[PDB]
Nucleic acid binder design. Structure first.
Ligand SMILES: [K+]
Ligand SMILES: [K+]
Length: 327
DNA sequence: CATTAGA
DNA sequence: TCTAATG
């Protein structure tokens, strides 16, 4: 957590690089298990050699550990950090809709900057255009105070359209968080669950609503179960318009809401942890259900859930307000 | 780890 | 169809 710190950081620096700038999925995957394993290790690595005894720790990496231990740096890292191409790649990547694969390509064509991409809007797809369009706004955090204004609007139309809907804004928003990165609305309806052959409209009606009143302003991608957009709070009585915000709405079979909600509410740890416990408690939990364990090794058979409680009850735990689902 | 775009 | 990009 801090004793193996630099080593793990150096290493991830390294991994991240192969994966992006290079297409070394392997080396990339290499640096990762290593950083992983050096990370668990309970002692101060004092040398490659010592490290080296670890699993995943080969000669390539150990060598790296010595240099880093030896001097407070590493050339390779110094070199990559300098590297205009790689730099270029790292940056393009901040554009929404630009993964590495596109970053490389663009670079190749020589589009290394924001300005570049503008001049070349034509080489970009809708998602990418939008992302470009909102590069600043997308990068900016969402203050809760705003999160409260968006949530408010959202539940309102949802309800106007059909009173049968159930919506929930998940994420750190749900867990307290002073600000968030984007809004995640989990949607469902009684008339749609596991079997009941869809109702693509169910997603549609809603988006259409939000659009109709100018809450939604663009669509990144819209499918029958997952819509991915951009929204904006009504710019007041002037002098202050709101930043463009990413939103995602997703339909869910009512018979799997709460686990979904559960899950998506996080946190990553509270989850893993509550999850590990259902194992003892004789269960299995995942983004959609909760099944009882069967001695033979594994088992099936989804228990029925009507609320975040049911899941709790089942693993015979203390109901945890989202607020403190921190871990 | 599953859903969407796009070519 | 595959492959990229999100989350
Ligand atoms: K080893
Ligand atoms: K990106």
């Amino acid at each position: 957590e801090t004793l193996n710190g630099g080593i793990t950081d150096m290493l991830t620096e390294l991994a991240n690089f192969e994966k992006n700038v290079s297409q070394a999925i392997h080396k990339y995957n290499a640096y990762r298990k290593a950083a992983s394993v050096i990370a668990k290790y309970p002692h101060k690595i004092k040398s490659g050699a010592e490290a080296k005894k670890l699993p995943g720790v080969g000669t390539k990496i150990a060598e790296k550990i010595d240099e880093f231990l030896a001097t407070g740096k590493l050339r390779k890292l110094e070199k990559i950090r300098q590297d205009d191409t790689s730099s270029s790649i790292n940056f393009l990547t901040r554009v929404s809709g630009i993964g590495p694969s596109a970053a490389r390509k663009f670079v190749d064509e020589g589009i290394k900057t924001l300005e570049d991409l503008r001049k070349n809007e034509d080489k970009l797809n809708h998602h990418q255009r939008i992302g470009l369009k909102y590069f600043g706004d997308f990068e900016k955090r969402i203050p809760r105070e705003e999160m409260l204004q968006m949530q408010d609007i959202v539940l309102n139309e949802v309800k106007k359209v059909d009173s049968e809907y159930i919506a929930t804004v998940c994420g750190s928003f749900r867990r307290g968080a002073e600000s968030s990165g984007d809004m995640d609305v989990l949607l469902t309806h009684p008339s749609f669950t596991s079997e009941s052959t869809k109702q693509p409209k169910l997603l549609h009606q809603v988006v259409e609503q939000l659009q109709k009143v100018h809450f939604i302003t663009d669509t990144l991608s819209k499918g029958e179960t997952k819509f991915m957009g951009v929204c904006q709070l009504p710019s007041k009585n002037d002098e202050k318009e709101y930043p463009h915000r990413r939103i995602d709405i997703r339909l869910i079979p009512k018979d799997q809401y709460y686990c979904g909600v559960l899950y998506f509410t996080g946190s990553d740890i509270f989850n893993k942890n509550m999850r590990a416990h259902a194992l003892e408690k004789g269960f299995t939990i995942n983004e959609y259900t909760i099944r009882p364990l069967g001695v033979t090794g594994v088992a099936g058979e989804p228990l029925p859930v009507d609320s975040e409680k049911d899941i709790f009850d089942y693993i015979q735990w203390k109901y945890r307000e989202p607020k403190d689902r921190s871990e």
